[PDB]
């Protein structure tokens with residue numbers, strides 16, 4: 001039930017861990033989704049990759065330098081594309097004096113430093129690199145092929161998932177930002193931190209997502225006027241100090257190497273990397289997602305954006321509502337706790 005809607009951390013045994021789909025159903029039976037985000041720490045014997053040394057040779061084709069403007073907990077960001085580099089070169093840069101993690105006492109002290117130094121040196125991120133770095137034959141929690149209902153309709157019904165169910169690699173350095181968002185089509189996500197420094201996350205319960213949008217609309221009117229779903233551009237930064245002051249509930253947690261974070265449908269989240277690191281992620285869905293997909297508010301203002309047709313999901317998994325929905329009369333309010 002999780003009535004505080006606080007972020008839960010799961011420590012499965014190996015036997016609990018083996019089957020992702022089953023373990024996710026279990027997390028939801030304990031109210032994990034109410035917080036919009038959850039942590040799963042695998043048992044210590046499980047290693048998706050024996051040795052990471054080879055990853056030094058991976059090319060980062062399109063590093064992004066993040067240019068953040070604003071103050072007092074409210075910022076907007078834009079990107080400058082930089083020359084390709086290897087992971088090795090990226091790590092050497094991240095670890096330099098100009099880019100390295102500052103001295104800090106504890107995670108709370110580092111958090112204060114992130115919010116206070118955002119508009120000084122511009123950090124550089126490698127994101128959205130296609131690929132997984134799990135060894136071959138690792139069959140548990142394999143981000144490249146989780147086999148959820150997205151894969152079912154893609155594979156059995158020929159429906160296009162627009163590449164959101166394929167693996168992406170992210171290489172962080174100190175201060176790199178992931179700005180407030182929900183996933184494409186308000187899907188689930190999963191994020192494994194392979195190695196390196198931690199990533200801090202913020203999350204807002206899906207039941208308060210519309211409250212967050214209302215506040216963002218008030219503090220960023222020009223952005224709002226330009227696009228109905230402007231937070232989907234992932235360029236909007238809003239500090240925990242501002243959320244607290246305007247009564248938006250949220251929680252924070254720090255993800256360490258070897259841990260998974262899972263985001264739930266319509267769970268707004270943001271965060272920052274503590275230092276050099278490597279993470280792998282993808283989007284997925286369950287039957288409970290379908291009602292969120294059907295009402296997901298989409299980016300109007302650039303033709304590139306991800307749109308997945310919901311028809312097949314409704315026809316297959318909500319056959320009693322299909323007709324009604326095809327008539328534009330399947331109107332409901334989501335219960336985010338159920």
Ligand SMILES: O=C(O)CNC(=O)C(=O)O
Nearest residue numbers: 170178189190191263281
């Ligand atoms: O690690 C990052 O930069 C961002 N990740 C996500 O928002 C996600 O995994 O859903």
Ligand SMILES: [Fe+3]
Nearest residue numbers: 182183189263
């Ligand atoms: Fe995300």
Ligand SMILES: [Zn+2]
Nearest residue numbers: 227299300301
């Ligand atoms: Zn837009």
